[PDB]
Scaffold this active site. Structure first.
Site, PDB file in Angstrom:
ATOM      1  N   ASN B  88      27.032  -2.375 -58.445  1.00  0.00           N
ATOM      2  CA  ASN B  88      26.850  -2.744 -59.856  1.00  0.00           C
ATOM      3  C   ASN B  88      25.392  -3.053 -60.135  1.00  0.00           C
ATOM      4  O   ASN B  88      24.770  -3.811 -59.401  1.00  0.00           O
ATOM      5  CB  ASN B  88      27.669  -3.985 -60.211  1.00  0.00           C
ATOM      6  N   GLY B  94      27.764  -5.009 -64.668  1.00  0.00           N
ATOM      7  CA  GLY B  94      28.515  -6.212 -64.366  1.00  0.00           C
ATOM      8  C   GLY B  94      27.951  -7.006 -63.203  1.00  0.00           C
ATOM      9  O   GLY B  94      28.630  -7.883 -62.665  1.00  0.00           O
ATOM     10  N   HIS B 101      24.236  -5.464 -53.177  1.00  0.00           N
ATOM     11  CA  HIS B 101      25.471  -5.537 -52.398  1.00  0.00           C
ATOM     12  C   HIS B 101      26.405  -4.372 -52.704  1.00  0.00           C
ATOM     13  O   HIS B 101      26.422  -3.848 -53.824  1.00  0.00           O
ATOM     14  CB  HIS B 101      26.194  -6.877 -52.617  1.00  0.00           C
TER      15      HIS B 101
HETATM   16  N1  LIG Z   1      32.131 -14.358 -50.060  1.00  0.00           N
HETATM   17  C1  LIG Z   1      31.639 -14.763 -51.213  1.00  0.00           C
HETATM   18  N2  LIG Z   1      31.667 -13.918 -52.249  1.00  0.00           N
HETATM   19  C2  LIG Z   1      30.977 -14.402 -53.351  1.00  0.00           C
HETATM   20  C3  LIG Z   1      30.387 -15.627 -53.488  1.00  0.00           C
HETATM   21  N3  LIG Z   1      29.740 -15.739 -54.721  1.00  0.00           N
HETATM   22  C4  LIG Z   1      29.993 -14.610 -55.284  1.00  0.00           C
HETATM   23  N4  LIG Z   1      30.754 -13.743 -54.550  1.00  0.00           N
HETATM   24  C5  LIG Z   1      31.253 -12.414 -54.935  1.00  0.00           C
HETATM   25  O1  LIG Z   1      30.104 -11.578 -55.005  1.00  0.00           O
HETATM   26  C6  LIG Z   1      30.387 -10.470 -55.801  1.00  0.00           C
HETATM   27  C7  LIG Z   1      29.081 -10.030 -56.485  1.00  0.00           C
HETATM   28  O2  LIG Z   1      29.331  -8.834 -57.218  1.00  0.00           O
HETATM   29  P1  LIG Z   1      28.779  -8.545 -58.671  1.00  0.00           P
HETATM   30  O3  LIG Z   1      29.637  -9.201 -59.652  1.00  0.00           O
HETATM   31  O4  LIG Z   1      27.357  -8.760 -58.675  1.00  0.00           O
HETATM   32  O5  LIG Z   1      29.025  -6.975 -58.723  1.00  0.00           O
HETATM   33  C8  LIG Z   1      31.541 -10.923 -56.707  1.00  0.00           C
HETATM   34  O6  LIG Z   1      32.660 -10.101 -56.508  1.00  0.00           O
HETATM   35  C9  LIG Z   1      31.852 -12.345 -56.297  1.00  0.00           C
HETATM   36  O7  LIG Z   1      33.216 -12.689 -56.308  1.00  0.00           O
HETATM   37  C10 LIG Z   1      30.501 -16.570 -52.426  1.00  0.00           C
HETATM   38  O8  LIG Z   1      30.121 -17.742 -52.435  1.00  0.00           O
HETATM   39  N5  LIG Z   1      31.117 -16.033 -51.286  1.00  0.00           N
END
Ligand SMILES: Nc1nc2c(ncn2[C@@H]2O[C@H](COP(=O)(O)O)[C@@H](O)[C@H]2O)c(=O)[nH]1
Ligand SMILES: Nc1nc2c(ncn2[C@@H]2O[C@H](COP(=O)(O)O)[C@@H](O)[C@H]2O)c(=O)[nH]1
EC number: 3.9.1.-
Lengths: 115, 115
Positions: B88, B94, B101
């Site tokens: 993303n 999003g 990641h």
């Molecule tokens: N394992 C883990 N996942 C996290 C943490 N904070 C955020 N995430 C996950 O990181 C992801 C980041 O993805 P984004 O929303 O940027 O595409 C999200 O799905 C969210 O749930 C955390 O403290 N630990």
């Protein structure tokens, strides 16, 4: 053949037309025939790899190259508020073409879960 | 710091716990705290790159490495009927964490459009 025996191989060989955005020695980027967002293109390698589960450790740079090319094309197409890159693998992933490809969609808010 | 100043940097430095699946010199794979499918993990680089639009041409192998590691972890976790990889970028994509990641989801049928 070279390019593979899927329609993607035909596109690479210019046997059937596609709206080609960019092309270099390793890949080709062209618009998807069925857009799921205002901008929806695919970046595919010229080397036929049928599935991402079948890619080798040596295909690492190539795979990373699809992403670098994907981000450059997205910016050039004006996806400045962002986009989403997607790789589908097998039945559960929804893969239909057995030639590795990266989807890039943008132009609208992408929702979550990603399918 | 090294690892970056986001929570991902804290995870890399083992300052806050995560369910770590695999780790090598370049990346780390751990389960997502809010799964969107039965198996939903993330593969992140140890080098902090804030966005995929900010990755350099030199980050190509690294980026491809996240995908190779993603496919090996998926197979090891039993996603044999397939999965979907997702990156993303920005607001429209999003993105919420500004550390590059790769999402890997599987264990159920992934639908289309991908969000
Ligand atoms: N394992 C883990 N996942 C996290 C943490 N904070 C955020 N995430 C996950 O990181 C992801 C980041 O993805 P984004 O929303 O940027 O595409 C999200 O799905 C969210 O749930 C955390 O403290 N630990
Ligand atoms: N440009 C172009 N896109 C195609 C053609 N055949 C299939 N596609 C697109 O290729 C994509 C393959 O993605 P998959 O479903 O495997 O994840 C689909 O989105 C589909 O619409 C074609 O002939 N030309």
């Amino acid at each position: 053949r070279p390019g593979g025996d899927t329609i993607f191989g035909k596109i690479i060989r210019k046997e059937i037309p596609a709206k080609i955005i960019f092309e270099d020695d390793q890949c080709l980027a062209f618009h998807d025939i069925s857009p799921q967002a205002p901008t929806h293109f695919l970046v595919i390698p010229k080397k036929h790899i049928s599935q991402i589960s079948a890619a080798e450790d040596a295909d690492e740079s190539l795979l990373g190259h699809l992403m670098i090319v994907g981000k450059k094309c997205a910016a050039d197409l004006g996806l400045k508020k962002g986009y989403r890159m997607v790789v589908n693998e097998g039945s559960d992933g929804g893969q239909s073409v057995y030639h590795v490809h990266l989807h890039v969609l943008g132009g609208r808010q992408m929702n979550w879960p990603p399918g």
